Amino acid sequence: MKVLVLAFHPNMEQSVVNRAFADTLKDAPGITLRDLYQEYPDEAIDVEKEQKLCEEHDRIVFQFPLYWYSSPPLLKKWLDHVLLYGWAYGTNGTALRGKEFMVAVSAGAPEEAYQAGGSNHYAISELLRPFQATSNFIGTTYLPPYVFYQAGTAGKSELAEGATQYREHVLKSF
Numbered sequence: 001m002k003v004l005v006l007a008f009h010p011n012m013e014q015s016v017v018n019r020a021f022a023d024t025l026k027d028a029p030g031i032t033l034r035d036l037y038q039e040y041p042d043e044a045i046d047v048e049k050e051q052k053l054c055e056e057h058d059r060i061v062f063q064f065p066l067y068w069y070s071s072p073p074l075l076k077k078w079l080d081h082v083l084l085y086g087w088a089y090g091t092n093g094t095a096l097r098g099k100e101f102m103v104a105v106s107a108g109a110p111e112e113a114y115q116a117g118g119s120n121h122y123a124i125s126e127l128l129r130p131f132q133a134t135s136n137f138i139g140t141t142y143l144p145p146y147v148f149y150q151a152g153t154a155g156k157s158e159l160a161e162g163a164t165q166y167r168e169h170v171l172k173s174f
């Protein structure tokens, strides 16, 4: 029901794919969409603010483009700075236990590339393992990701169908 979408794109105005995906949620009740590079242009994160928002939602969605098979660096900094002892883990660290955790990621390469025998050799499930392990450690339930391939070169209509598929997935109950 209550879904926090944390979008991590260095320039959401120049973005093509993630911008389109984000647009489909600007009116869905229950959705809190945020543009983190926009809110923290100097990457100085308000830890308590972030923590408090996670607390108030039932599902947390990390949305980003696939950059070198990982995320943009602000998400990495977000994990490091926000997920603290006594909050996310550790003795009292139980604030996220029970909440849902999912990744929505767009990739330039085709789906064919992400498999054994394909040009990138590994399935997306393999590449996203740091995020799944993060989920595992902090007590959240790891949901299947939303993945969009051929991002940027897939075509006008394909992108539109991709966007509507993104919306259904993010709102889907599992």
Ligand SMILES: Cc1cc2nc3c(=O)[nH]c(=O)nc-3n(C[C@H](O)[C@H](O)[C@H](O)COP(=O)(O)O)c2cc1C
Binding pocket: 009, 014, 015, 016, 017, 018, 019, 064, 065, 066, 067, 068, 069, 070, 105, 106, 107, 108, 109, 110, 151, 152
């Ligand atoms: C620095 C950088 C690294 C990238 N690394 C990958 C990658 O490892 N695998 C891949 O499929 N695409 C990669 N891409 C292409 C992006 O995934 C693609 O631009 C993005 O998913 C969708 O773009 P948009 O939301 O900004 O429109 C990379 C792009 C940039 C700029």
